[PDB]
Design a binder for this molecule. Structure first.
Ligand SMILES: Cc1cc2nc3c(=O)[nH]c(=O)nc-3n(C[C@H](O)[C@H](O)[C@H](O)COP(=O)(O)O)c2cc1C
Ligand SMILES: COC(=O)/C(CN)=C1\SCC(=O)N1c1ccc(Br)cc1
Ligand SMILES: O=C(O)c1cc(=O)[nH]c(=O)[nH]1
Length: 364
């Protein structure tokens, strides 16, 4: 399309030339929340529908956590053509996150590095925001457009599992799925929650809290993992997820690694790296986790998706659904329909009747 070129060649480079990335993000959140978006001309075909996590998803392409941290732009993101929206991470108490600057573009790499540190309006503020559109969301959910809520921990929390439990109690009843984010690289100690003994204790407490919610308000619970895990850590996660009946995995968060070859001047900033250089590390992590779980645990695949091919690679490796964030920085809103159109094309070329038939196809 005309819109795809204009955004990619003119609008987004202009925005980047005028605004630091934090400012640009805030402007984007505001524009999205007001629906000031190009026409999403693409119409989701039936071949893109997926049923997973107790829900229908109109298309498998979602917005990854971090773009709408505080649940301000949900409706605008469905307008953009996402099949599902995930907000957060949300922490129990409000907190400012790290000092500025804390996000960095690597345009030569089609990558970003961030160290926001869980800036968050907190559970109460987000609860009230979601409550104001709760039945609008119920209708969307029924129509195949579900909502996820991603939960974090405050910086000075003295009991991580209690922070997560509080999130389950407060936002659980407003979500179609919850995400226990134990993979931010930007909160000290947080990734150690991925260890076997810590995850089992943490997850058992999360699941108990969830199961105490009334049936119509009881979300699926997913765990979001890092791309930097050891083999032992992956095996341990898979074991715990099976043991406890965790509903799904989100694979992956940003990487603390710096793959060889990065060109951006800002490559050595501290934080998590996203976008193109994370792509195949994330696809590989999906593949491994799918195998370790016997294909029985739904996976949301994320990291470096900016085309239909990238989405199909993750689906074929084991993802039921995919998410993207960093591709918007570079391509803007038209990227969404681009992914979807390309994905539909490739599915037909590869002889799949729909997305569902492609899930895990590389393992067979
Ligand atoms: C600026 C920024 C902020 C993020 N904040 C969060 C977050 O609060 N919670 C979370 O689970 N992931 C967070 N993420 C990670 C993304 O959800 C996603 O896992 C990652 O960026 C890989 O996808 P991408 O390459 O399409 O950006 C963030 C990513 C970026 C770029
Ligand atoms: C001055 O800023 C704009 O014109 C923007 C952007 N943030 C526009 S114009 C139409 C549009 O879609 N956006 C936009 C919205 C979300 C995102 Br993500 C990127 C750009
Ligand atoms: O720093 C953050 O808030 C954030 C960054 C990120 O890359 N991942 C995440 O889970 N949190």
């Amino acid at each position: 399309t005309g819109d795809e070129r204009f955004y990619a060649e003119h609008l987004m480079p202009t925005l980047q030339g005028l605004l630091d990335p934090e400012s640009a993000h805030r402007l984007a959140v505001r524009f999205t929340s007001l629906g000031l978006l190009p026409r999403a001309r693409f119409q989701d075909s039936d071949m893109l529908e997926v049923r997973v996590l107790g829900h229908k998803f109109r298309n498998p392409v979602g917005i990854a956590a971090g773009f709408d941290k505080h649940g301000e732009a949900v409706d605008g993101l469905y307008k953009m053509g996402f099949g599902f929206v995930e907000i957060g991470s949300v922490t129990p108490k409000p907190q400012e996150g790290n000092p500025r600057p804390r996000v960095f573009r690597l345009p030569e790499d089609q990558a970003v590095i961030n160290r926001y540190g869980f800036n968050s309006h907190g559970l109460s503020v987000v609860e009230h925001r979601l409550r104001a559109r709760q039945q609008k969301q119920a209708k969307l959910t029924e129509d195949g457009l579900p909502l996820g809520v991603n939960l974090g921990k405050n910086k000075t929390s003295v009991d991580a599992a209690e922070d997560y439990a509080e999130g389950v109690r407060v936002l659980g009843p407003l979500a179609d799925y919850l995400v226990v984010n134990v993979s931010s690289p930007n909160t000290a100690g947080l990734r150690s929650l991925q260890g076997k003994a810590e995850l089992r204790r943490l997850l058992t407490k999360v699941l108990q809290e969830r199961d105490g919610l009334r049936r119509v308000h009881r979300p699926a619970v997913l765990v979001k993992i890092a791309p930097d895990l050891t083999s032992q850590d992956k095996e341990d996660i898979a074991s715990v997820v099976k043991e406890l009946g965790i509903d799904g995995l989100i694979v992956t968060n940003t990487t603390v690694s710096r793959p060889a070859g990065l060109q951006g001047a800002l490559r050595s900033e501290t934080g998590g790296l996203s976008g193109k250089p994370l792509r195949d590390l994330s696809t590989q992590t999906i593949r491994e986790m799918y195998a370790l779980t016997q294909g029985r645990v739904p996976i949301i695949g994320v990291g470096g998706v900016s085309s239909g091919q990238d989405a199909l690679e993750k689906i074929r490796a084991g993802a039921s659904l995919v998410q993207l964030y960093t591709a918007l920085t570079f391509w803007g809103p038209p990227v969404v329909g681009k992914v979807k159109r390309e994905l539909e094309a490739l599915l037909k070329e590869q002889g799949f009747g729909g997305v569902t038939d492609a899930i895990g196809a590389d393992h067979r």
